[PDB]
Amino acid sequence: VQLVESGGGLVQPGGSRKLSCSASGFAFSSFGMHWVRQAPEKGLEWVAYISSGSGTIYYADTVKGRFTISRDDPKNTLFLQMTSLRSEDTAMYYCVRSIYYYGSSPFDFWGQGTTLTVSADIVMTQATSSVPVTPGESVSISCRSSKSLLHSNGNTYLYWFLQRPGQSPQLLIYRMSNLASGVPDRFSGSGSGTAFTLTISRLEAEDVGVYYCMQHLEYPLTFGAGTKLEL
Amino acid sequence: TASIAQARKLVEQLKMEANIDRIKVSKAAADLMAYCEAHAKEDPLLTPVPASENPFR
Amino acid sequence: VSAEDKAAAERSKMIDKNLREDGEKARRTLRLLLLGADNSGKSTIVKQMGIFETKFQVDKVNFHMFDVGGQRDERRKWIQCFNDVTAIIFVVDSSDYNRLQEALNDFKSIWNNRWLRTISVILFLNKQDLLAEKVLAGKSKIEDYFPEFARYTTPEDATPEPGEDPRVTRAKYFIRKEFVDISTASGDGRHICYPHFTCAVDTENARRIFNDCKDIILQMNLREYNLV
Amino acid sequence: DWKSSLILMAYIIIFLTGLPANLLALRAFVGRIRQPQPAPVHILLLSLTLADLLLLLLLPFKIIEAASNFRWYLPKVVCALTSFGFYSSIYCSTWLLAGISIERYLGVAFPVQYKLSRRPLYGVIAALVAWVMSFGHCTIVIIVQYLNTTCYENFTDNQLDVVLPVRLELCLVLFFIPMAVTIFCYWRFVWIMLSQPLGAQRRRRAVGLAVVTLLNFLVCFGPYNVSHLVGYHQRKSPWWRSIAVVFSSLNASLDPLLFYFSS
Amino acid sequence: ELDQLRQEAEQLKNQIRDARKACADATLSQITNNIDPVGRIQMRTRRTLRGHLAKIYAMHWGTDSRLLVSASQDGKLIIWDSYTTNKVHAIPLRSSWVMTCAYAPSGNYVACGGLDNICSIYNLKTREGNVRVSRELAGHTGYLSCCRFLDDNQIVTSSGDTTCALWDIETGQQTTTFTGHTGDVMSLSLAPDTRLFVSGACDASAKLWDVREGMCRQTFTGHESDINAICFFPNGNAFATGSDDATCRLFDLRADQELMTYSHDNIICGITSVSFSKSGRLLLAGYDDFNCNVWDALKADRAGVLAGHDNRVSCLGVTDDGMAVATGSWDSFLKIWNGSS
Ligand SMILES: Cc1noc(C)c1-c1ccc(C(=O)N2[C@@H](c3ccccc3Cl)SC[C@H]2C(=O)O)cc1
Ligand SMILES: CC(C)CCC[C@@H](C)[C@H]1CC[C@H]2[C@@H]3CC=C4C[C@@H](O)CC[C@]4(C)[C@H]3CC[C@]12C
Ligand SMILES: CC(C)[C@H](C(=O)Nc1nccs1)c1ccc(Cl)cc1
Ligand SMILES: CCCCCCCCCCCCCCCC(=O)O
What Gene Ontology molecular-function terms does this entry list (chain D)? Predict the structure, then answer.
C-alpha cells in the first residue's frame, strides 16, 4: 500500500498540466480513487473522483470541465489532466483511495502529494481553529453541518482526518463511530445527525496536527476549516 | 488383534456413556418449555414484528 | 440510496458482471464423472489426457472428467455434487468374473440412486483382450459363477464385427446384456446406459464418449422443446 | 345468421379453452425466464404465449362483433385498435412459431455446439424480428391510412385499390418467409430425428409432434393468408376471410397444448 | 476376546437403554398439550438473492444478522449483504466442489470445504482490499461436510472419514481429533457456549463431543437413516436432527433420549437442513420436496410451509436476532424469509 504522485512543478496561468498517481501494493482496480487539493496555508477540498471500473465520475463545481480525471487499470496509474489553470489552482494535490462496500473504510490511504505552483453544498463549520493543549489531558474537536448527515439507512456519513505537520492526512474515524485500522483506541467519535464531536482520551506527542471534518451524504464532498492542536 | 483393541475401545466408551447422571424427561421437557415461553416475546418469526422493524421489509 | 450505497451497488454490479463472464466461460466445457472398481483400469479409458480432474478435447469440445479417488469405500453422500454432470463414465473389468457380481451390484446402486434419476451412464467393458484370452483358454467357466449362462445362447442378429470365435462373442454379449438388464429395469426412459467395449489399448474411447454425449445432449434438447 | 352462429361458438371455445391454458403457460414460462441461464427457446415460447394471449384478450371484441351479426358497434376507433391487435398477433405468431423451428433444427442438427453456444440474447433478437416485422408492418399500414384519412372489412373500390395490394405483401413477406423457414426446419428435424440410429426417448413422439406443429401452423395460419392472394386475383375481399381468421385464432389455444402441457 | 467383548458391549447397551427407560416418566407431548399452539406461521419471500450459477450447497449468517456467505458448485463464495441484496465480496474458490461454508463470529474470516478434503480460511478484512486465502487446513482423508469457527482461530470441521477435528488456524495442525462415528459425518452444530459440539453421521446416530476433553460424552440413536443436518437448541441443553427417513427428531443433553418426532405421511423425502428459531418454539427444516416445512418444536404440528423454491432446499439459517430465515436451494436462488403480521 503506497501511493506516489509526480508531475507538479510550475505552470503559467491558463496552461495545461498532467498529474500522475502511481499505485502499487493493493488491488487498484477494486478501489475508487479521489483527487484532493490543499492550498498553501489553507484547508483541503475535494476535486474529482472516479469509481472502480470508471463508471461514475464526479467533479467539484469549481473544477468542472477544466479538469478531467482518468484511471488506468493495467499499470495502476491515476491521471488528472489540467486545462486552463487559474491562479487559485496552486495547491498540493493528494491521491486518496476509497473502497465502497458494507463496512468498508473509504479515504483510508492518502498519497504523498505533489506541489503545484501557478505563477447547495453542505458546509462543515469548525469554529475553533487553534486549541493549545498539553499531552495527558483530553481535548474535544467539534464539527457541525448545515444538513443532517444521518441517513435513512442508519449511517451518519461523517469522517475525520489527522494531518501531521509536513505529512499527509490520515483517516481516524469513518461513519462518525467506527475507528480506522491502526488508529489507537484513544480516539473516539460520537454526536448526532447534525452535531459531531471528536474526543481523545489520552494525548501523546504524535497527536499534534490539524483535524479536518468530512461529509459523504452527497457527491460534492466538503471538508472542514480545520482545528490545529498546538503543543 | 486390532479387532479386540477396537472392541475394547467400544466397551470403554459404552461404559462412559452408561455412567451419566440422566434427569427425568419431565424436567428436561419443562426446561425447554420454559425457555421457549421466557424468550417467546423476542422471536420475530413466531411473533411477527411491525413493518417498521422488519429490516428486510 | 446514499453516495456510499450507490458505489456499493456499482461494486455489486461489477461483481455480477464478473460472475456472468466466468459462468459464460465455464459453460463451454462438458463435465463427466468417472466411476469404477480398483481393478477396473478406470484411469486408462481416455488415454491421452482429492479429485483427479482430467481434461480432454475432441471435435473442439472441451471435456472435464472428475475421478474422485480416495474418499471412502462408499460412493454415496458425495454423489449429490455430481447431479449436473452430462454423463457418468462407468468402467468395469469384464475379465475378472469373481468381482463381476459386485460390479453388477455397484451398477444397480448407481442406476437407482435418487439423485442420478436423470443422469445417463456411459458404460465401458474394460479388458476385452483378457476376457477373450480367458474364454479361449477355458480354464475358468462363466457358467460356474452365473448359472444362467449355460442356458443362454447368443443373441440373434447380433453385430460381432471383429473376427472372433462364437465363444468370445457369446461371453461379451452375455456380460453386455447382464448390464443392460439392470440398465433398463428402471429409469422409465429418463436416462439410458450406453454399453461399449474397451481393449485397454484403444485410443477411440474419447470418440465414443463424445459420440454418446451428442445423444445425451440431443435427448436433453428434445426434452426442453417438449418434443419428448 | 347460420354462418355467424357457429363463428361465435368457435370463438367462445377458442377463448374459453385457450385463456386459462395460455395463463397457466405464462406462469411456468415466466418462471423459467427467471431461473439461471434462460434458453433461446424459453424467450420465444414466452413470446408466443403473450402474443397468443393478446389475441385471446382481444377475442371478446371479435365475439361481440360477430354476436351483433357484424353490426351494432357503438365503439368506433376501437375497430382500428382491436383489429390491429388481432390481425397483428396472427402475424407475430406466424413469426415466433417460425423461430421456435430454427431453434429445433439448430438443436437436433448441431446438438452439442448449441447447448454450448445458446445465449438468451439469440432468442431476444428473434422475438424482436418477429414483433418488429409484425406489429411494425401493421402499424405502418394503420398510420398510412390515417395520413390519407363496417369493421375494417367492407371497403370502397377506391379503398380496395389500396387494401387488396397491401394484403399481398402481408402474405408474401409475413407468411411466405415464416412458412418457408418452418417447412425447411421441420423437415430437417423430422429427417434427422429419424436417421439418428439411436430409438431412445420416444423419438416417434418427436418426429410426430413436429409434424403436428408444422401441419397446425399450415392449417391455422395458412387458410387466412391464402385469402389475401385469392382476393388479389378475384379483385375483391373474400367473405371467407371472416371464417379463415377463426382458424388463425385456433392456434392461440392449440399452442399451449403442443408446447407447454406435457402429454 | 471378541465374544466376551461384544458380550460386555451388549450388557452395557442394556444398562444405557434401561437407564434411559427409567428417565422416561412422561413425554414432551403429554407435558405440552395444555399449552396454546403457535397457530399458522405464514412467511413471505422478503428478498431474493441471485447471482449464483449453480446449486447452492451452504449458507451461514454473520453475527451482525446482515451479512451471509453462500457457497455453490459454481466455484464462488459470495458474501451477501442481505439488507440490500448487495454482493460485498465474490471469492473464487480453488476447488469448485464446495459442500460447506462458514462465517467466523468475528466477521473477519470465512471458511469453505468440499471434496478436496481441505478447509480454506479466507481473510475478508485485508489491507490490500482483496480477500485472500490465509490458511489451508489439510489432514482429512475425506470430503468436508461442515465447518464452524470457535471464536477466531479454532475451527471444528467434520469430514467424510468418520472423524471430526478441531483445528488451529495459526499453526494449521489438528489440535484435537474426534473419533467414534462408524459412518460419514454430514453436519455439526456448535453449542452457544462453544464448549460442546454435536455431529450427525450417516450411521443413524448423533454424538455429543467436548472440545477441551477431546472425547465424546453422549451418543444418541433413533433415526432410521442418515442424519443429513443437525442443529442445537438455543438454551444449549437440547438439539434437533434432520434425517433422510423424513423424520426430524429433538434430543436432549440430560435425559439422553429423543423427545418428539416431527413426522407426516404427506412428506416422504428426507430433511436436508434443520435450523432453530431464536426462542426455540419454531423448528425450521428444509426438505428435498423444494419446500421448507416449519415445525412447532413443542407440538410437532406443521405451523407453515415456506413454499417458494424450485429444487431441493439445500441450506437453512436463522439470524442471530431471529429477524429472518434464509433458505438456499439448488436453483442457485437464496431467499430471505421474514414473518409479517
Ligand atoms: C393503408 C390503408 N389506407 O386505407 C386503407 C383502408 C388501408 C388499409 C388498412 C388495413 C389493411 C389490411 O388489410 N390489414 C392491416 C390492418 C387491418 C386492420 C387494422 C389495422 C391494420 Cl394495419 S393488418 C392486417 C390486414 C388485414 O386486415 O388483414 C389494408 C389497407
Ligand atoms: C412478441 C410480442 C408480441 C411479445 C413481446 C415479448 C418479448 C419481446 C419481451 C417481453 C418480455 C421480455 C423478456 C423479459 C425479461 C427477460 C429476462 C432476461 O434474462 C432475458 C431477456 C428477457 C427474456 C426479455 C426478452 C424480451 C421479452 C421476451
Ligand atoms: C391439422 C391438425 C393436426 C390440427 C390439430 O388438431 N393439431 C392439434 N393440436 C393439439 C392436438 S392435435 C388442426 C388445426 C386446425 C383445424 Cl381447423 C383442425 C385441425
Ligand atoms: C433462433 C434462435 C437460435 C439460438 C441458438 C443458436 C445456436 C447456434 C449454434 C450452431 C451454429 C453453428 C456451429 C458450427 C457448425 C459446425 O459444427 O460445423
Answer: G protein-coupled receptor activity; lipid binding
| Full domain range(s) for residue C212 | 3-225
Ligand nearest to the CA of D246: 3
What Å resolution does this PDB entry report? 3.2
C104 burial class (0-12, 13-18, 19+ CB within 10 angstroms)?
middle
In a domain, E40, yes or no: no
Say if the Cβ atoms of E332 and D36 lie within 8 Å: yes
Same domain? For A110 and A144 the reply is: no
Q: How many domains does chain E have?
A: 1
Q: Domain range for residue E156?
A: 47-339
Q: In what order do the strands lie in the sheet with E227-230?
A: E227-230, E238-243, E248-252, E258-262
Please check whether residue A231 lies inside any domain of the structure: no
Q: What is the DSSP string of E265-287?
A: TT--SPEEEEEE-SSSSEEEEEE
Is E152 a member of any domain?
yes
Q: Report the distance separating Cα D216 and Cα D259, nearest Å.
A: 12
Which ligand sits nearest to residue D80's alpha carbon?
1
For ligand 4, is residue D155 a contact (CB within 6 Å)?
no
Domain with A169 in it: 124-224
Does A28 lie in the same domain as A83?
yes
Chains that touch D (3 or more CB pairs under 8 A): C, E
Per the structure, the count of domains in chain C is 1
> Which residues in chain E have their CB less than 8 angstroms from residue C71's CB?
115, 142-143, 160
Q: Count interface pairs D-E at CB distance under 8 A.
A: 10
Please answer whether residues E213 and C106 qualify as being in contact, where contact means their C-beta atoms are separated by less than 8 angstroms. no
DSSP assignments along chain C, one per residue: --HHHHHHHHHHHHHHHHHHHHHHHHTTEEEEEEEE-GGG--TTSS-----EEEEEEETTEEEEEEE--SS-S---SSTTGGGS-SEEEEEEESS-STTHHHHHHHHHHHHT-GGGTT-EEEEEEE-HHHHHHHHHH-SS-HHHH-THHHH--PPTT----S---HHHHHHHHHHHHHHHHHHHSSSTTSS-EEEEE--SS-S-HHHHHHHHHHHHHHHHHHHHTT--
CATH tag, B4-56? 4.10.260.10
Q: Which of D117, D124, D184 to mutate to test the pocket of ligand 4 (most atoms within 8 A of CB)?
A: D117
Structural domains of chain D, ranges and CATH numbers in brackets: 2-259 (1.20.1070.10)
Do C91 and C124 form a contact (C-beta atoms < 8 A)? Answer: yes
Strand A210-215 vs strand A158-163: parallel, antiparallel, or unpaired? antiparallel
Question: Which technique was used to obtain these atomic coordinates?
Answer: cryo-EM
Interface of C with D (CB under 8 A): 23-24, 27-28, 30, 61, 189-190, 192, 213-215, 217-228
The domain spans of chain B are 4-56
Residue A103 one-letter amino acid: G
